């Protein structure tokens, strides 16, 4: 049946996977050992002893990020060999993780992917978590999925990844990795969920009242969205939507696979005590520019495709009531060649909440996946800051010292100039 395997790359993917596989196990009721005191058959597989093992591979070139998971509360839940570590990391260098350090453990990771794929009968797709910033999350993530394309030509590979924020930044040589990572996500990727950390900070400070949030709070929200897309896979629904159908109704041309995610209602129970939360209300929250997960203005770019993922105590009629208003809104724009740009998804069970978490439980919820042309301006922002560092050849000697030919720095930039000009073509209306 439907199965998805986790190929979480990087420290960010390991931390998110810690948050995700927590939210996964309490969603079904899996004890920390891994015993139920077949909806799990998308994410867990049985053994001879009646134990459910996650379909995940946590891979890093530094041991400590995985070592704490080995000493975490879920040490015995996981299969130890799926926790793959490395002696030395790329140290925020794209060239180190791609040509020098990545190739040492390519065979071990791919063989693990083969064994987990051999466990499944019908594989729907792969979900991959990494970042554009870290060397492990950028260079090594690029090579494995270049090889995964030729190993599995038809199998789907979604790409949820972390975007360098427009203002705040953790590292300095991040944009060199980002410019050198974005080529792989073009010719070898089916959909991209590039999000920046800075967007989570604002919604956590406004909606959830958290004036002092940390990555546990950011990662819970990410896991909920991933819980939302796979909810129709895990459970029944009036309109159950798998990965393939919503894959088709976002991608007009093979080059454009960059939708924007949005979740609602994300509201602290202090606000939710006296607040009416209805279906017509929450979809308006999905359309909020301040609630967008990517730091761009929705009004700058018109919409080509939208995905609606309702979940909980919802009915089609108020969904029909909700959508009919959204079309009668002037300043919200749509492309001329898409008169109908929605994909309605309805599920039964409301989302679960973790103890010690942030989100107030709501009987209903909605996830929004919007492909708009406003996102391309964020790449342009990346293109400027890469220009004023490459002109005087800053930090180039590190990548060259690894064995990388400096012309690829030029070609990767021309990829985005051609990529952004294609987003402009969609914006032109005949």
């Amino acid at each position: 049946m439907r199965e998805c395997i986790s190929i979480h790359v990087g420290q960010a993917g390991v931390q998110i996977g810690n948050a995700c596989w927590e939210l996964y196990c309490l969603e079904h009721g899996i004890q920390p050992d891994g015993q139920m005191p077949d909806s799990f058959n998308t994410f867990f597989s049985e053994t001879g002893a009646g134990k459910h093992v996650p379909r995940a591979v946590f891979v890093d070139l530094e041991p400590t990020v995985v070592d704490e998971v080995r000493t975490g509360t879920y040490r015995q839940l996981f299969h130890p060999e799926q926790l793959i570590t490395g002696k030395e990391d790329a140290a925020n260098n794209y060239a180190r993780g791609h040509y020098t350090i990545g190739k040492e453990i390519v065979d071990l990771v791919l063989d693990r992917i083969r064994k987990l794929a051999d466990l499944c009968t019908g594989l729907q797709g792969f979900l991959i978590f990494h970042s554009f910033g870290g060397g492990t999350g950028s260079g090594f993530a690029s090579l494995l999925m270049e090889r995964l394309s030729v190993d599995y030509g038809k199998k789907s590979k979604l790409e949820f990844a972390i975007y360098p924020a427009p203002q705040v930044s953790t590292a300095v040589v991040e944009p060199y990795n980002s410019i050198l990572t974005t080529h792989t996500t073009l010719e070898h990727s089916d959909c991209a969920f590039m999000v920046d950390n800075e967007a989570i900070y604002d919604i956590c400070r406004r909606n959830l009242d958290i004036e002092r949030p940390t990555y546990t709070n950011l990662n819970r929200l990410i896991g909920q969205i991933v819980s939302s897309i796979t909810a129709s896979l895990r459970f029944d629904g009036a309109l159950n939507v798998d990965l393939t159908e919503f894959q088709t109704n976002l991608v007009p041309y093979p080059r454009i696979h960059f939708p924007l995610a949005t979740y609602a209602p994300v509201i602290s129970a202090e606000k939710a005590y006296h607040e009416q939360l209805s279906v017509a209300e929450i979809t308006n929250a999905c359309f909020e520019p301040a609630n967008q997960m990517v730091k761009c203005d929705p009004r700058h770019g018109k919409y080509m495709a939208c995905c609606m993922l309702y979940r909980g105590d919802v009915v089609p009629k108020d969904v029909n009531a909700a959508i009919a208003t959204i079309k009668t809104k002037r300043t919200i724009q749509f492309v001329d060649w898409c008169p109908t740009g929605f994909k309605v998804g309805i599920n039964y069970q409301p989302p679960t909440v973790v103890p010690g978490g942030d989100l107030a439980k709501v009987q209903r919820a909605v996830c929004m996946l919007s492909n708009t042309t406003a996102i391309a301006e964020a790449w342009a922002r990346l293109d400027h800051k890469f220009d004023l560092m490459y002109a005087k050849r800053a930090f180039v000697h590190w990548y060259v010292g690894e064995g990388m030919e400096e012309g690829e720095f030029s070609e990767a930039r021309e990829d985005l100039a051609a990529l952004e000009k294609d987003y402009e073509e969609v914006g032109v209306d005949s």
Binding site: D242, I323, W337, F342
Partner: protein, 428 residues
């Protein structure tokens, strides 16, 4: 004798047919175990039309369920009348079409058509004298709008004389849940015009409006929409399974409202639809049914017969009444609304009456109408289809299946031809 096979395709078709077999089992008094606990003898005389006989007085449905995604099979199995079916008749694939028309029609459909045809052939040869087949599907999917057209083409050459019936679901412009929906429809309707005796355009949006306005439902679900469809298609065969004041079947009608082979597109209706508040008032009477026969808020279609001319009208009645007023409400409604009926066909309306009323109800009927207004739906789709095809948007998915580019052009040409002669017959 007169048997019908209930071929079932797609999640829309699988759910709609599942609610059917619950409804018609109740009319014949069949438990979810399968036996007969009905009281009247006439409740069990013609059950061989839809049901094959099984041991212990059991009646397995004559239905075969097709879907690329095996997830929906678990849902209908877990339903109320789930174990009633024969799992030898579920034929399902492992990978879905993903709402892609080209994937179903060529790529993945070719591997599953053989097993579906084998089950259909087994059911076709099981009964001595078939009346025909019956398909329920949606035009906005990948399975029902996909291989369902392929199954039609194979069956038509296999059984040409036999009448086939399809209660297709047409996507709505106002409410749409698929972006590639105009692409699937425009390539599926071309299969419909070539090989179809009779088609019905049921629109989910008008299901929404009736639930909002007629039934005044606060929270109607999808089961309510199918239960209404469960009433509508049951009435077209009530004259078949049951004797009537004036008997009828599928063939006696299907000959009558098809003036030319190209036009088999109609708007179904259902008589006694009211909300609970309206039930206290009103009088049980056939004139109220006639007011509901041609009722504004009655029919299922997404189009309005103010804007066209009624070519033909049919009205099959359920229950025991007197014959007279039925033919007079017939006659007067022709006289006053004269412009809305075509002039080249005298007596545009046809009627049939079945003696047995529906379960729990004293009076019912079904409306069958051919009007020029169904052309409103087609030119809407071309407005959506041409805009998407002008920039070759969403084309690589279909093009990746190995199909050409000219198939889009000939499909729209046939519809542009179809609406041209359809418009011509309006101005005649």
């Amino acid at each position: 004798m007169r048997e019908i096979v209930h071929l079932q395709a797609g999640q829309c078709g699988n759910q709609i047919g599942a609610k059917f077999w619950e409804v018609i089992s109740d009319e014949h008094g069949i438990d979810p175990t399968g036996t007969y606990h009905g009281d009247s003898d006439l409740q069990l005389e013609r059950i061989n039309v839809y049901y094959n006989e099984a041991t212990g007085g059991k009646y397995v449905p004559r239905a075969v369920l097709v879907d690329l995604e095996p997830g929906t099979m678990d849902s209908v199995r877990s339903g109320p009348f789930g174990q009633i079916f024969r799992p030898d008749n579920f034929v399902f694939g492992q990978s879905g079409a993903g709402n892609n028309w080209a994937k179903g029609h060529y790529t993945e459909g070719a591997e599953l058509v053989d097993s579906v045809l084998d089950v259909v052939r087994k059911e076709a040869e099981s009964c001595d004298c078939l009346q025909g087949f019956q398909l329920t599907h949606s035009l906005g999917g990948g399975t029902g709008s996909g291989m369902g057209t392929l199954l039609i083409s194979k069956i038509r050459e296999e059984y040409p004389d036999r009448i086939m019936n399809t209660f297709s679901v047409v996507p709505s412009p106002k409410v749409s849940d698929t972006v590639v929906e105009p692409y699937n429809a425009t390539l599926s309707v071309h299969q419909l015009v070539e090989n179809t005796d009779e088609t019905y355009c049921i629109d989910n949006e008008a299901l929404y409006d009736i639930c909002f306005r007629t039934l005044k439902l606060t929270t109607p679900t999808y089961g309510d929409l199918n239960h209404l469809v469960s009433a509508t298609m049951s009435g077209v065969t009530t004259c078949l399974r049951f004797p009537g004041q004036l008997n009828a079947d599928l063939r006696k009608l299907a000959v009558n409202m098809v003036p030319f082979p190209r036009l088999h597109f109609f708007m179904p209706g259902f008589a006694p639809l009211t909300s609970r508040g309206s039930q206290q008032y009103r009088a049980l009477t056939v004139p109220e049914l006639t007011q509901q026969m041609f009722d504004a808020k009655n029919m299922m279609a997404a189009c309005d017969p103010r804007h066209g001319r009624y070519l033909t009208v049919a009205a099959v009645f359920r229950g025991r009444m007197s014959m007279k007023e039925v033919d007079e409400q017939m006659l007067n409604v022709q006289n006053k609304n004269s412009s809305y009926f075509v002039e080249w066909i005298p007596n545009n309306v046809k009627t049939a009456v079945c003696d047995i009323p529906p379960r729990g109800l004293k009076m019912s009927a079904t409306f069958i109408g051919n009007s020029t207004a169904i052309q409103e739906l087609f030119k809407r789709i071309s407005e959506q289809f041409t805009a998407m095809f002008r920039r070759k948007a969403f084309l690589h998915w279909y093009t990746g299946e190995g199909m050409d580019e000219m198939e889009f052009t000939e499909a729209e040409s046939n519809m542009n031809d179809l609406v041209s002669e359809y418009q011509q017959y309006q101005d005649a």
